[PDB]
Structure 1
């Protein structure tokens, strides 16, 4: 009755043929998987003069000597080695004096005095994009821009989403951007919260923001990937697809979003979105028999352009079930092209059953329980490496339901999905719950909803993360 399994923690592959399970420690003693050819990554700043000055101060202070938080749990709050001789990225970050743009004080008051909600956001986005385009068209081009948001603009704009509208109009530029509030770069300043007024917000310490921001900046600037999931020995070649759904901007419709992922010929990884919008079909979170084929055709066409041959396995992940039609279209395309092995899995974070054990701390991360054809997987909980349970109440398990047309058993699928959790380049944490393809699909659909009709869509992942 209810046979259970416990999986080991997967290991990521870093540079120089080194593998570990901690992204922080594996970077600090082996470097990135792909090394940058060159020493300098150039950073541009756009915002207020105070924000530019404390951004420069923050960069210098972080580069010099910053250190961790506490003596308890040494494997959970590591110190930052700094951008010196023993930097984890083996490269240097510099800011040029010509790639810095300042917003005049005689315009933020114009933004703040408008009694309309949409127009102020629109013109602030217009000003920021105008300065960025003027910087890009010149000869002082940076590799990654930092948009530091002042508190005066933040009060008017945050209190229509701003991040989505800004990243939708910054798609034509040649460099990605990174939004930073005034709290992170400069201390002694606190931002008041939303409708729950006079409570403000709290952030991490100095040594976690540094790790996350520096990893994101390196990935956005260099273009190379820091780490990747270690392949096993003897597996078949496979490609991963992830599908999500998202509502309209203001109305009540539902579009679908997709992301694709596979492995390079040498030592690399490929993670992209698409180059087109998937239109509308109503208000149900379900695809059709025509929109399910085209994603499979694009996924199979992307693999042959790199490996010169079709893959032997296709892996599809979704949140809203495979009743009869999407599965029919996927199977039809898959048996039409070349492929013998297939997998269709529906994940849901809505089940009510849990597992209760004696003691104080909850169950271990990676525990798997088989309920007939369904799998209860705990990709959250206590970890021996960290030394505690990083949470408050209890882990929320995932329920895995494979479709009735699938090859692998549910244990191998659970192991594969458990392996694809620490490949999030936005964060350096070890307690991720969702697998990478659906997270990428949600991140793509977060900003794909604020792009107007007939505009451009980029397949680069650096413009969505």
Structure 2
């Protein structure tokens, strides 16, 4: 008949320049400035170009428009005006000189015509060679892939994005890919906000971070990818770790699960040895980045369920004093929720005009809970201060929640729900308020695609800046 009492958690706060809090990312960025601007790293954001000589004009056009103000056109309820790169980020955006504008060889067009994607990525890096010598002179490289290369973008078992990112990752060169999507979109402010924030993050800056974070907690997310070949299937599993250091930092890294190279798995669930190995690597990274202390309590998030050996390895890799939480994330569920307003004035109990608020979680049983990572948020709207805003109104008429399964734990759902919801906003690669999934899962998925595409880069920890 009636379920147990639910609860809603406040929309989490983002930290900005001089320790200021703002719920709206773009509004806070325009009004206070980026978090790393107070420590002025980078002092400037230097750019480099990677495009054919026939498409340099689009690149200089997009940088120029990045340097100039722009106003929102679509989704104006949450979308604020762009005030220009140097005004918003308090740090200039330099337009690259003649020696920092790289030209791809003409062989790239022929390779694209012949459909060899791997040769295309090799040719792009071969073109970008000189930037390796010049990498001291700039920070971030802009790469433009024309629409004439579409046939080599993503076919069976190949991905140009993952290949190029994997090839340029060891070179310690953050790059940005620009397609016709960023250039032929009606809402220029979306392109401007997203590109500017991504460039600032790639140059080494921190656009924002959660306000109230405990530095004694670690977050782990494991996701898997599917590789198809004639022999069978191989499951590429990679782990992502999120935590903050003791001071003025933000660690967002991903690393592979494989103990040795050429260890093939046909199922997503990892063995006892593999769980011990990966969780110990996570502990070692946290140890290095935390002056030798161990985490008081650890969160592990996974797409699939925890088998018994995995639980045993998780319990055995850490000590007894450190609490361990295992949480299942399920995207698809049979439940949906409807918001009903209460009795106010003369209007009786009636359904609200806007859907259920984001942050509302429903405890289903002693081990399962439904968390609404999608919903309406108060205090964000620009047109009407009192009107709620729902991001995916043009996609989902109603929010569809996700379901959490607790495999081990004695505490309540408040802590895990707060952590999961707070971890949905620090994806600097998007330009919207929040993500449906926590950032650990999406970063693990991206690195899983990257590792599956190129398996030669394993056993090296990599930061988010190289794969966003």
Partner of 2:347 in structure 1? none
Instruction: Give the secondary-structure state (helix, strand or coil) at the position aligned to 2:117.
Output: helix
- Take 2:217 and 2:137, find their aligned partners in 1: how far apart are those partners? 38
Q: 1:395 to 1:320 in 2, by over 3 A?
A: same
Partner of 1:372 in structure 2? 365
Q: Is the contact between residue 355 and residue 376 of structure 2 (CA under 8 Å) also seen in structure 1?
A: yes
Segment drifting more, 33-42 vs 425-434: 33-42
Considering only aligned residues, what root-mean-square deviation do their CA atoms show, in Å?
Answer: 2.4
- Take 1:157 and 1:292, find their aligned partners in 2: how far apart are those partners? 34
- Take 1:17 and 1:101, find their aligned partners in 2: how far apart are those partners? 39
| Shift, 1:249, TM fit | 5.4
Instruction: Give the secondary-structure state (helix, strand or coil) at the position aligned to 1:56.
Output: helix
Partner of 1:262 in structure 2? 243
Q: 1:42 to 1:228 in 2, by over 3 A?
A: same
- Take 1:56 and 1:129, find their aligned partners in 2: how far apart are those partners? 21
Q: Is the contact between residue 275 and residue 459 of structure 1 (CA under 8 Å) also seen in structure 2?
A: no
Instruction: Specify which of 455, 460, 464 is matched with residue 461 of structure 1.
Output: 464
Instruction: Give the secondary-structure state (helix, strand or coil) at the position aligned to 2:237.
Output: strand
User: Could you give the per-residue CA deviations for residues 319-344 of structure 1, whole angstroms, max 9, x where no partner exists?
Assistant: 11113110011101123xx6432211
Unpaired runs of 5+ residues, structure 1, are 188-202
| Shift, 1:286, TM fit | 0.8
Q: How many equivalent pairs are there?
A: 435
Q: 1:138 to 1:224 in 2, by over 3 A?
A: closer
Partner of 2:270 in structure 1? 287
Are residues 1:164 and 2:162 paired? yes
- Take 1:137 and 1:260, find their aligned partners in 2: how far apart are those partners? 32
Q: Is the contact between residue 257 and residue 445 of structure 1 (CA under 8 Å) also seen in structure 2?
A: yes
Deviating runs (4+, > 6 A) in structure 1? none
- Take 1:180 and 1:311, find their aligned partners in 2: how far apart are those partners? 40
Length-normalised TM-score, structure 1: 0.86
Are residues 1:229 and 2:210 paired? yes
Partner of 1:199 in structure 2? none
Instruction: Give the secondary-structure state (helix, strand or coil) at the position aligned to 2:100.
Output: strand
Instruction: Give the secondary-structure state (helix, strand or coil) at the position aligned to 1:380.
Output: coil
- Take 1:284 and 1:275, find their aligned partners in 2: how far apart are those partners? 16
Unpaired runs of 5+ residues, structure 2, are 340-350, 382-387
Partner of 2:328 in structure 1? 346
Q: Is the contact between residue 4 and residue 363 of structure 2 (CA under 8 Å) also seen in structure 1?
A: yes
| Shift, 1:435, TM fit | 1.0
Segment drifting more, 237-246 vs 411-420: 411-420
Q: 1:271 to 1:394 in 2, by over 3 A?
A: same
Instruction: Specify which of 186, 208, 211 is matched with residue 193 of structure 2.
Output: 211
Q: Is the contact between residue 16 and residue 29 of structure 2 (CA under 8 Å) also seen in structure 1?
A: yes
User: Could you give the per-residue CA deviations for residues 405-429 of structure 1, whole angstroms, max 9, x where no partner exists?
Assistant: 3132123211221122101111131
Partner of 2:302 in structure 1? 318
Q: How does 1:123-272 map to 2 (within 5 A)?
A: 123-138=119-134, 141-155=137-151, 157=153, 160-185=158-183, 187=184, 203=185, 205-221=187-203, 223-231=204-212, 237-248=216-227, 250=229, 251-272=232-253
| Shift, 1:157, TM fit | 4.6
Partner of 2:28 in structure 1? 26
Q: 1:369 to 1:139 in 2, by over 3 A?
A: closer
| Shift, 1:122, TM fit | 2.1
- Take 1:104 and 1:320, find their aligned partners in 2: how far apart are those partners? 45
Partner of 2:83 in structure 1? 81
